[PDB]
From a paper:
Fibroblast growth factors and their receptors (FGFs and FGFRs) play a critical role in many physiological processes including embryogenesis, wound healing, inflammation and angiogenesis as well as adult tissue homeostasis.
Interestingly, the gatekeeper mutation V561M resulted in a clear reduction of sensitivity to PD173074 and AZD4547, a marginal effect on sensitivity to AP24534 and an increase in inhibition by TKI258 compared to wild type. TKI258 binds more tightly to the FGFR1 KD V561M (Ki ~ 35 nM) while binding of PD173074 (Ki ~ 1580 nM) is greatly obstructed; structural insights highlight the underpinning differences. The total number of van der Waals contacts for WT FGFR1 KD and FGFR1 KD V561M are 28 and 37, respectively. In addition, M561 pushes two water molecules and K514 out of the binding cleft, which was observed in the TKI258-WT FGFR1 KD structure. Thus in the gatekeeper mutant, the polar charge contribution of K514 and two water molecules are void at the binding cleft leading to a stronger affinity of TKI258 to the kinase. The structures of TKI258 bound WT FGFR1 KD and FGFR1 KD V561M superposes on apo WT FGFR1 KD with an overall root mean square deviation (rmsd) value of 1.02 (287 amino acid residues) and 1.01 (286 amino acid residues) Å units, while the drug bound WT FGFR1 KD and FGFR1 KD V561M superpose on each other with an rmsd value of 0.36 Å units (293 amino acid residues). As first suggested for SRC T341I, the valine to methionine substitution in FGFR1 leads to exclusion of water molecules and a re-arrangement of K514 side chain potentiating the hydrophobic spine (that now includes M651) and facilitates coordination of ATP by K514.
Numbering used by the authors: 458 to 486, 490 to 580, 591 to 764
Write the structure that this text describes.
C-alpha cells in the first residue's frame, strides 16, 4: 500500500512484540481498538491486560503517520499519572504502527453521566461523587499543566472512566493545526467543540493553560447537568455574539452556589484572573471533604 515511506526508529524502552498483542473490537474512530496484551510487564509474562490500541486507517497519509508518532513521543515525554490515559507500549517494527494505551472500560464521561440520570440502566450519583469526578479531572489537568502540556480540547467527551470509576484525561498529546480548525464541524454526539473554547482561543487562536481552565469550567457545567449540552440550539455565529456580549451559562438545577461560583471564575473575561488548576485542585479537595454522600 506504500506503508511506509520512511523508517521508524526502534525504542527498547517501549517496544512490544506484535504477537503479544491480541486485537479485539473497535472502540472508536486513526482508530482505537480493544486488545489483550500478553506479558506487558516483563516480569510477569503469563498475564493478559486489556489495553486500547491506536493505529492508522488504510487511507492514512505520511502526515497521519507523523501525527500519531508525535502523540506517542509526547506521551513518552509527559510521564505517568493516575488521572490521564497513559502510554503502555508500542509496536513500531516490521508492520503498521500500534500505540498501546490504557483501557477505560466504562467509556467517556459524557455518556457515563447521561446513563446515570434519574429515569423518566445503572444507579444515580451523589453530590459527593460528582464533586469527586471534578476533583479527579482537575488533578489530571494540574499534572499536565505542571508538565507544560496545553490540552486545547478539554471536554467530558475526552475524559474516560475506568472499571474502578477513575477519571482519566485523554487525547492530551494530539498534534492538531489550530488554524485549519473548522468552527462548523460537529462532534459525533452532534455538538460544536467551539462551545468549550475560551474567547481568546476562539477569536484570537491563543491557547494557554488559562484557556484550558475555561474549558474546565464548561466540563464542570457538564458534570453538574449530568452530561448536558452547552448552549443547546445555538449556532457558531450566535455563539460568537453571546461571548462578545459577555453571556455565561445559567447555574445548573442541582448545584451549589460555591461550585457555580467556581464555574464563573473559570469563565473570567480576563485570563490572568481565572484560577489555576492547582488552586482548583485545592478548592475541590476542600469541597469534596465537605460534601455529603447522601
Ligand atoms: C457498554 N460499554 C459502553 C462503554 N464502553 C466503552 C466504549 C467506548 C470506549 N472507548 C474507550 C477508550 C478510547 N476510546 C481510548 C482512546 F480513544 C485513546 C486512548 C485510550 C483509550 N482508551 C479507552 O478505553 N473505552 C471505551 C469503553 C464499553 C462498553
Ligand atoms: Cl514515569
Ligand atoms: Cl460532547
Amino acid at each position: 500500500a506504500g506503508v511506509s515511506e520512511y523508517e521508524l526508529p526502534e525504542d527498547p524502552r517501549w517496544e512490544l512484540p506484535r504477537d503479544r498483542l491480541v486485537l479485539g473490537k473497535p472502540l472508536g474512530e486513526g482508530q482505537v481498538v480493544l486488545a489483550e496484551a500478553i506479558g506487558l510487564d516483563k516480569d510477569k509474562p503469563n498475564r493478559v491486560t486489556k489495553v486500547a490500541v491506536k493505529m492508522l486507517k488504510s487511507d492514512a497519509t505520511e502526515k497521519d503517520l507523523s501525527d500519531l508518532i508525535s502523540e506517542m513521543e509526547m506521551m513518552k515525554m509527559i510521564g505517568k499519572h493516575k488521572n490521564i490515559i497513559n502510554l503502555l507500549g508500542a509496536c513500531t517494527q516490521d508492520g503498521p504502527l500500534y500505540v498501546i494505551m490504557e483501557y477505560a472500560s466504562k467509556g467517556n464521561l459524557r455518556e457515563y453521566l447521561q446513563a446515570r440520570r434519574p429515569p423518566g440502566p445503572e444507579e444515580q450519583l451523589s453530590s459527593k461523587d460528582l464533586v469527586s469526578c471534578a476533583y479527579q479531572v482537575a488533578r489530571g489537568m494540574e499534572y499536565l499543566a505542571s508538565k507544560k502540556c496545553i490540552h486545547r480540547d478539554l471536554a467530558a467527551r475526552n475524559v474516560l472512566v475506568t472499571e474502578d470509576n477513575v477519571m482519566k484525561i485523554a487525547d492530551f498529546g494530539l498534534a492538531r493545526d489550530i488554524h485549519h480548525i473548522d468552527y462548523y464541524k460537529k462532534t459525533t454526539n452532534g455538538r460544536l467543540p467551539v462551545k468549550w473554547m475560551a474567547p481568546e482561543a476562539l477569536f484570537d487562536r491563543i491557547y494557554t493553560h488559562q484557556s484550558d481552565v475555561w474549558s474546565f469550567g464548561v466540563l464542570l457545567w457538564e458534570i453538574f447537568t449530568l452530561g448536558g449540552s452547552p448552549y443547546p440550539g445555538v449556532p457558531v455565529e450566535e455563539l460568537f455574539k453571546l461571548l462578545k456580549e459577555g453571556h455565561r451559562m445559567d447555574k445548573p438545577s442541582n448545584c451549589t452556589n460555591e461550585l457555580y461560583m467556581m464555574m464563573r471564575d473559570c469563565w473570567h473575561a480576563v485570563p490572568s484572573q481565572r484560577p489555576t488548576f492547582k488552586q482548583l485542585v485545592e478548592d475541590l479537595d476542600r469541597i469534596v471533604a465537605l460534601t455529603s454522600n447522601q
